[PDB]
Amino acid sequence: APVLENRRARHDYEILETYEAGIALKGTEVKSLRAGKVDFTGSFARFEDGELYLENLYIAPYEKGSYANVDPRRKRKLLLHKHELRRLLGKVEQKGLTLVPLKIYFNERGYAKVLLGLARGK
RNA sequence: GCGGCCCCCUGGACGAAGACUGACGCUCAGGUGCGAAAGCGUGGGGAGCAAACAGGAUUAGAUACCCUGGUAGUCCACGCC
RNA sequence: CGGCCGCAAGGUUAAAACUCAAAUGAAUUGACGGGGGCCCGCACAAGCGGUGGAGCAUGUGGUUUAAUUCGAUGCAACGCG
RNA sequence: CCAGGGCUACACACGUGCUACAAUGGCGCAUACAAAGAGAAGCGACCUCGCGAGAGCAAGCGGACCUCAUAAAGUGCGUCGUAGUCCGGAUUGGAGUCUGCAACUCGACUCCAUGAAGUCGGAAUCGCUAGUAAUCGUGGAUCAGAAUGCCACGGUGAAUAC
RNA sequence: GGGGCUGAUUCUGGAUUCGACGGGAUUUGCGAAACCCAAGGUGCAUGCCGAGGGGCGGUUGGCCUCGUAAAAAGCCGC
RNA sequence: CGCGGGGUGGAGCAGCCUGGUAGCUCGUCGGGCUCAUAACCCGAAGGUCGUCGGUUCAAAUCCGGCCCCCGCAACCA
RNA sequence: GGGCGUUAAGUUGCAGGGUAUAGACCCGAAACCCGGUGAUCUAGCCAUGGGCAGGUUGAAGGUUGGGUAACACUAACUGGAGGACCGAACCGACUAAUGUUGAAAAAUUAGCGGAUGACUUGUGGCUGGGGGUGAAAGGCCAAUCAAACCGGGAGAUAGCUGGUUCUCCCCGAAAGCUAUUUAGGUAGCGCCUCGUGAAUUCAUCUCCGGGGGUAGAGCACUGUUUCGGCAAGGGGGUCAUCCCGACUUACCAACCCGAUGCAAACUGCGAAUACCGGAGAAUGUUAUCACGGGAGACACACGGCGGGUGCUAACGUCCGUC
RNA sequence: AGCCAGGAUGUUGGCUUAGAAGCAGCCAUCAUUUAAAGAAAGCGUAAUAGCUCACUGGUCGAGUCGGCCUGCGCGGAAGA
RNA sequence: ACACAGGUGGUCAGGUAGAGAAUACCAAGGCGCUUGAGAGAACUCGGGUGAAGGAACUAGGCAAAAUGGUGCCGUAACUUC
RNA sequence: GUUUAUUAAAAACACAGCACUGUGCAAACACGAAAGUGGACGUAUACGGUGUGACGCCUGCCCGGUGCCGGAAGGUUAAUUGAUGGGGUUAGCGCAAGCGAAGCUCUUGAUCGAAGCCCCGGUAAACGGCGGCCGUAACUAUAACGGUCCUAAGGUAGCGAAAUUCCUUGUCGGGUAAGUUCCGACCUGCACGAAUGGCGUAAUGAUGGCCAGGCUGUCUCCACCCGAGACUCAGUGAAAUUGAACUCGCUGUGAAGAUGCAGUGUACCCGCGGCAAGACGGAAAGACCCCGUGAACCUUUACUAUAGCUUGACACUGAACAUUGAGCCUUGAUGUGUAGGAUAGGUGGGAGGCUUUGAAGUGUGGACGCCAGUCUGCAUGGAGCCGACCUUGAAAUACCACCCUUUAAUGUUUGAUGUUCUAACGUUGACCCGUAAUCCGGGUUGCGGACAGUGUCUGGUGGGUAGUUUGACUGGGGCGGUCUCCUCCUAAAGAGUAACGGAGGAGCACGAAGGUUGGCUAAUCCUGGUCGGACAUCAGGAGGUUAGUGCAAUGGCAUAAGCCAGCUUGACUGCGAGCGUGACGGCGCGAGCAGGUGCGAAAGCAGGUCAUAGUGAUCCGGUGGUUCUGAAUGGAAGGGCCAUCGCUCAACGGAUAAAAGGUACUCCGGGGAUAACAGGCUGAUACCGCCCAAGAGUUCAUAUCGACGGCGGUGUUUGGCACCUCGAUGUCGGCUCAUCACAUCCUGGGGCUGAAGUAGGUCCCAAGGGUAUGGCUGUUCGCCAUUUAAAGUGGUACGCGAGCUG
RNA sequence: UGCCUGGCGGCCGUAGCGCGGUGGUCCCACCUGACCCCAUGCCGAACUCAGAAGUGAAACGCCGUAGCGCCGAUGGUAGUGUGGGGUCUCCCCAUGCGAGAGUAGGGAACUGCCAGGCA
C-alpha cells in the first residue's frame, strides 16, 4: 500500500498550510517504507540548525522477509527550497505552530516524499 | 389479569328483611392449585406487527437508533415452563 | 457444590474462600443542558440610512525586509495605547 | 552618544472610515440664518503683491472689544439634459508655494495639464425610536508642520412601531 | 534440484527527488588571507641581531620591553 | 471481414438526432452562512471534444477517412 | 544461345528376376461390426405353494384394588407387541488349520452371524448384450463380463515375435548420412551383386603446382594472473596544526612502462600428416566411371591414436580416424 | 667413534620480575678469564639445583663425513 | 467329467436323559464307506497329558486354554428410561 | 439389514428421518421410430429426481466463476425473402472501335427474421470458494482492531497431532521397569469445519486401536502318549518336466553369478530313507517399466457428429371484422445563424400574380408551439396586398416548380395487435350401434379449435450416445528443455563431422541505409582552452583503424565494404558459358549475350544492401494480363500460360479444414533394444588407513588430539553406467539354520601412556571360543528398561519363501 | 656516360620510425593573388584558377647514425608420419620431417622505362 495519510493527527492538531518535502532516506528505510508498519505516533519535524529534520518517525527496519537495516527512529532531514523553507520556520513560533507529518509516499518520478503542515487546535 | 353484540355454563361480591346452624374461627412450615410476557412441545392458523435475517441510509466507525423488506413469534387447541 | 423440578431454555434450594471500609436511604449550595415553564432588554421586528462591490484615507493578519520597534486579538483587538 | 535607515515595505486578506457612481445633481452668479471653541515662542486685521498656495508691511486684541471668520446646506436667477456626461475625482506629468537644520526615502498645500474604477452594489451586515437618524457646514486638542481620525458645536430635518 | 518475483511508481529515458545540509564551478563588491606595491604620514630610521617577563601553566615566537646588561603586555584553564 | 456502438478536464460522465454553452460533479483555492465549527452555498485553474481532410457565417456535434478500443457473428495459405 | 529431341529397332511369344492389385511367405492378437442363441447359474420383479425345535423378554391395551373433595397417582393381575433377546432345522460366511497334480475348478474340520423377517424355500412367469438387473461391488446375466455366448464380415489388422525344408561353385556387405507423428519402420544416397559400355579410367610412389592455421610455440593484436617501481600527486598514523618538516606507514584515485607464465568462442609464428592438382614408370584378373536388373543395411562392439562429456571414473557416453 | 679429562667470567645477568639464578616469560645476544665453556643444550628442583651436553685437552692411530647421478630391492600392503 | 467328503423341495418322527427336532446312548431299519498285510524312524496331519513360569510368543493372545446349566441373592458408569 | 458367487463383510450400500427440486394428471419421468405400457386404476398428505443419513444441539461468511430460475432497452445472429450493382448471351446500330433493347442466365446480397450468446436480477441442504501481503494493544509474543490486494468473500460454532499432522516418536500429562501404539491435554490445523453436513450421543457391531483379570505349550523349551500317513510286503498304477549327458568342490575365466572353460583339489561301482543350498529349479511368451503412429472401457469447457430438448419459416391451415407500426403516393402545414421593414431551407422560372369564381383589416371557434408568433373554416367585412427596395455571404407570403428538414392528415403497400364466430384438427368427457368387447371403427353430443400436434427446412442446446485425436527427441519414462534458420568453438592446418557439449543471434530493417560520380577518414591518450566532468564541442600533438560496419559471431574492408554530397532507379526484363553445394525437392555464385536504363568528360560501374540469418513445399482458391483450350457450332463458364496474393502448416519436408485426458477394472504384440530387485563394471561419494605438522595438551606437536593441505586401501554406503535376466532371478523385516572375513566387542599375549594402585586411553599381535532378554514400532535401525566377561563390524542374491511367516 | 631531380612502375620493412647533417640554377615544395572556372557539410585549409616578390622554415629528397622496427643462422629444444616398446592420463627407442622463441649476425633498401637540369 504505497500511499498513506496520518490518522493520528486529524483529531489532535489542525493544518493551516501544507508543504511537500523530499526526505533524506538511506535505502533500507525506503524498503521499509515500500512496506507499511511505520508510524507517526509522536513524530513531527524540527529545525536543529537552519535545516529541518523530521524526527521520531519510526520506520520498522523491514518485515515480511526483513534483514539488516538502521536506527528505526533516526533524525531524517527534509528538503525544501531556501525560500519555501525560511517561511514555515518564522510561522512556527507565531504563538504556537508545529511541523507534523501529514502523509507519505513516492511521487511520479519514484521518490518518497513527505507532506507536512502547521498545527494547532488541541 | 379481564373491554364489540348475542345465548349457554359458571365463581365471587353487595344490599333488605327475617328465619336456621351454634364458635363450626383466625393464621398456616410442609402440601396443593393458579400464575403476565417471553420460551418449549404436538399440531392448526397466519392479515397486521415483528426478535432473527436481507438490503438501504447515518457515522470517524454504526454488527444501533431511521428507512424498505421479513422468519420465529404474536392467534387457536392441547401439554409444559 | 449437592438436591429436587423441567423436553429444553432453565427454575428452585443455596454457600465458602477471597476482597473492600465502606455499600445504602432521605435530605445540600451552586453552575451548567443541543431540559421544561414564566418573564425582561433596540436581543430579534416596522422603518430611514449604510458596510459587504469601487477609488482612496487608516488599522491589522500576512508577506517582505538588514529593521520593517513593543503592545492590543471573538463580542469587549483591527482610525486600539 | 551620533549618522543614515526602518516603523510609510506590498501577490495578497480583513476591520473602521472617507469620496462617488449624480438632476432631491453638478457649475457660474448673486443673496439669506448659526452654535461652540481657541489665541503671545499666539491669533494676526487692513494695505499692497502673486492666478493661487502664499509673501512684504502692519493695527488691534491675554481679549461679550481684537484676530482666527467671508458658516454650508438653503433661496434667486442662469446653463447642463441622463452621456461614463460640464457626474466622478483616483492616478501620473510639469511648475510652484509655507513649515522646519533637513521635505529622496515620507509633509501639507497651490496652479496648469491627465480624467482609473465606479451607472447605487452577493451571502450578508451595522446604525438609529426625535430634534433622533439622515444630511450640511464650524470649531478644539495633540502639533514647527503633518486630520477622511478623535473630541466638541449648531443649521436643515424625516420614516416607523401589530 | 528446477520455475517465477524482488534492488526505488512513469514500459528504451534524457537528471524535476524544485528542495536542505554538504561538495564542485563561475562572477562581485566588503573584510588582508581577497591582494599587491609604497606612495600617502613621520625622523634617526631600519633589519637582522641578542636577552628577559603577571598565585601557575600553555600559545601568538608572540602582545610588551630593555640595549651592552634587566622591568611591566592579549586569549584559554585551575 | 462486417454490421454496429463507443473516445471530450486529474479520473467520472452530459452535451451526439437541434448545430450555436464547452459544461455536471469528486477532488484542491478563495469567498460566503454561525456567536464559532460542522453541514449546506457559490466562483473559478483545467480538456486538438482522439486524429487529419472537409462543406458553414461557425463546428465536439452533422459529412470524410482513417489510427483505437468491444460486442458479436464469421476468416487463419 | 539454352532445354528437350533428331545421329542406338521394334514387337509377340516362352522361361526367369522385380513391382503393382489381390490373404500375396506361413502361423498368432486384444479388438470392431452383422445376425441369431441364452435369465435350467446368477441379479431384480410377478403369480402360486411351502418352512421357522426349544427357551426369553413382557410394549399398547384391559380389570380390580388402593389413594384423592375429585384428577393425579400408584399396585397387583391381565394382555401379548418387537426388522426384541438366547438357540437347532433353515439362510448366511467372520477367524484359523488342512487342502493347493484337492475328497472338491472354492471345499472339510473346529469355532462364527441371522434365525417372525427388508426372513427363507419349491414350481412357473418377465426383463437380452451398449442391453438387462444391481440395498452399488463395475456385482451378476450358465465354472466369464469395464460389454455374454454362437455363427458370419474373416485369411480383420499385426511397421511386432517366431519359423522358413536338397547340393556344389564365384563375389560379398551395412550397422553411415539425409528425411521421416521418425527413432528397433521406411525412403533416396553411400557400401554388395549381376550385366552392357567407356577412356590408362583408379590406387601406390617419385618429381612438380597448391592452399592451410592443427601440434608445438609465442604474448605483438588481444586477455587473464603474479611481482617491482616512477618524480609527482595522493591517502592514513605518528610529534598535533600544520612541522606546511621529518619518519614509518600499508593505501589505494585520475592516463604510467617493464619482466615471467598460459590461451576452446585467439596469433605480430607455425609444423608433421592429410588433402587437391600435373607429369611419369612399375604393379594391380578394371581395381575406375556411367548406365541398367536383384539386394541387404540405416541396434554396432572392442582395441590404438586425436578429442567433447564424466572424475583423462566405467566392459560409460558422443564424434574423427585406423 | 670410543674412552680419561675440562665445561667458565660480568653473570644469582638488567628486567611489565609475588619467587627466575640460562629455560613458555624479559630484551637484546653483547660483554670479562682460559686449552676451550653457550646471558644458553636437558631430564628437569621450593631456589640455591645434582647431573649430561654444544665447545676444549689428553688417549688412541688411519681413515672418516654426507650431498649429487644412476641400477635392483625394502616398509607403506586389511575381506569375506 | 468319476461308484466324487460337494448341491438337491416335500413328507414320516419310537425308548431313556433332556427345555428341545440340541446332544448322548438305543429301537425299527440301514450300514463298516471296493486295495489289504505288517511295522511302530524322522517329518506332517489330527488329538490326549505336562514340572516351574504364565503372553515373556507375535505385526496381533493367531491358535489354544478358558467360561458354559436351573433357581434364589446381588449387580456400577451411563441412559433415548 | 445389504455387498465384491470364487483373496475385501467393512468405516462401503441401504435405512427410517431431513432438505432441495420437478410434476395440475393424456402429470413429471421411464420402455417404446410408433401404437402402446409403466408412473397409477394413483391425483400435490400424490408421484419422480437429487443430496444427507436415527436422535440431540445445530448448520456461519461469499452469487464473482459454473449451473439453474427469472427479466429484458440495447449488440450480434439461421432458414426465408431477393433490393441494388456487376457479368454472359444478341435483335439492332455502327463501314470499323465498341455499344446494346427485350428475353433467358451467372453472380451480388440490401430489407425481413425467433431463440441463443453478450447483458440485468435472483439463487449455495445448486456445483463451488472461505486467501494473501502489510499496520496496530504496558516487555516480549499474539492481534479483539484497521488498511489492502478487486480474485465473490476470507472460517461462526464446534472440533483439532485427527480414519485428516508433512517436519513427527511434535510437547505436556497418564498408564509401563521401559509405551513410534493408547488415553487426556495443548494449538504450530504443512492440508478439520457445518446436509460433498459439524460436534455430540444411550444402544447395536464375526468393525479399527489400547488396557486388565482368568486362562493357558503362544512362549522360556520342549517331553511323553493315542490315532491317519510317511517306511516294508503284496495288487493296481499316475503327474508336471525333459536338446543330449559318462550330471563333484574350489579359485579364476567368460554374454559379466560355471557340473561342463583353465588351473587345481578331491572321488572305488550302485541303491534306500531323509533335508531343501544350486541346477538363475517347474508352472504362466512379466501384471511393474518402456515401446507399437496397438486395443478397449471411463472422463471432460478435447475434435467432430448425433438421438433428445428447444427457436423460427413453410405445409396440413377456417369465416367475419377492429385498432395500430412502418414504407410509398398526392396532398397541405415546416424552417425563431448576426446587421434588418421579420419564428429568411436550398437551389431555379421569376417584376406581377392574386382579389368581385367577391380583398384586406377588424371578431371567435379547432390548432401547433422554445405561449415568440402562425395558419385556418366560420364570419363582420367590403375592395386590396406586393419587388430590387438602402442593409443580408445569399431577397421575397409576388407566386410557381422538382425537393430535404419536421410535421399532419385521407389513401396505397407491408407488417404486427385485439374481438366475434367454426368447418379442418384434438379429445385418454358423455352416450349409440357393430358387440354380451376396457381394443378399434362409425355415429350423436359436449369441450377445445385453426391453437395444439406432425412433416420439411432452419439457429441454439446436446459426453445422453458415437467415432477418434491427445507428437518426437530423451543417458528408462515422466517433469524441465528442445524442434526451422544464422555465427563461433569442439573439428584432429581441404570439405564434412556427434552429444540434454561451451557461447551468442534470426523470423527484420532501408526507395536510401539501393545505383553511380566526386570527395572525406576513425578510436585511445597527452597539452591547452567556456560551462564540461574519466568521455559532450573546439586547438594542437601522439596514435594509426584498436574506430566504424542498421543487428549475433566469424571472416572482410583504406582502392575503403567506414563517412558526405549531386544526379538518379541496375532493388532492371529476357537469357546465361561455367562452376559451388546438396539423397532429392532445392540453394548459391557467375562472366557474358539482347533490349532498355542511371551515374561518369572518359576507362567504366550498376541485375539491390561488406558477406553469411531475416523462412514455408504441394494442394486449394483469389486478383491482373494473354482468344492457348472452349464437349454440335458462335460466344461463355471452367481449364492452361505469365505476374501476384492467402499458413508461428514454429513439432518449421509442412500426417486432418478440424481434436484433450483417465485406467489400480484393465487388455494384446513386443523388449533385458529400456526402468525397479539382485549381479557385473566403476569407486566420485562413503568407510578404513597413512603423509605433512601449525595448533590443542599447565611446560611439551605426535600420551590423547590436530588446522590447512597431500597419498592411498576396501567394495561397504549415496551414486554413475545399462553388460546378464522382462517366453518371470518373488521385494523389506521377523523366524529357523547358518558360513566366511578381521578393520576384535569379551577372554589371551604385548609397546607407549599425560600408566602409583584400582580403573582407563591408544597402538600392535591374536579369529580358539563366546558374544542378552525386554517396552514401542512392520521395521532393519533407534530410543528407553534391565542384564552380561562382552552384548563386535561386516561378507554370503543388502545368506536363508521348491524351508516358515505375510 | 656522371651528378641531380620529377613522373610510372617492379619490389613490398635488410625498403619503416627516430635522431644529425644537408639542397633550391633547374625540378619539387611551401609561397602571391582570387572578381572570376571550380570549392568549403564553416573556412581559398583542402579543391581550383591567375601567377612568381620570398623561402628552403615546414614537407620533400639525399647523406650519415644501430635508439626502436625489421630480416635472421648454426646447434639444441618442442611437435610429429611410419615401425616398435614402457612404469601407457604420459613417455622411450629406430627412421623421415623438423619448429616457435632466443643466440651469433645482417641491416640506414635494391631496380626498369620516360623526362628535365648541371658538368
DSSP string for A47-80: ESSSSEEEES-B--S--TT------SS--EEB--
Nearest nt by C1' to A91 Cα:
C62
Residue A106: all three cell numbers together:
513516492
Beta bridge partner(s), residue A18? A117
> Contacts of strand J, CB cut-off 7 Å?
A 1, 4, 35-39, 60, 63-65
Cα(A10)–Cα(A33) distance, integer angstroms: 22
Q: Which residues in window 78-97 of A are less than 7 A from strand C by Cβ?
A: 83, 86-87, 90-91, 94
What is the amino acid identity at position A85? L
Q: Where are the domains of chain A?
A: 1-122
Cα(A57)–Cα(A109) distance, integer angstroms: 23
The number of C-alpha atoms within 13 Å of A81 and in the hemisphere containing its C-beta is: 2
Residue A43: all three cell numbers together:
513524530
| A83 sits within 7 Å of strand E by its CB | no
Q: Torsion over CA of A38, A97, A85 and A83, rounded to 10 degrees?
A: 150
Q: How far is the CA of A62 from the C1' of J167 (A)?
A: 28
Fold of A1-122: Small Protein B; Chain: A; (2.40.280)
Experimental approach: cryo-EM
Q: How many Cβ atoms from other residues are within 10 Å of residue A63's Cβ?
A: 12
Cα(A62)–Cα(A60) distance, integer angstroms: 5
Decide: helix, strand or coil at residue A76.
strand
DSSP H helices, chain A, are 28-35, 82-90
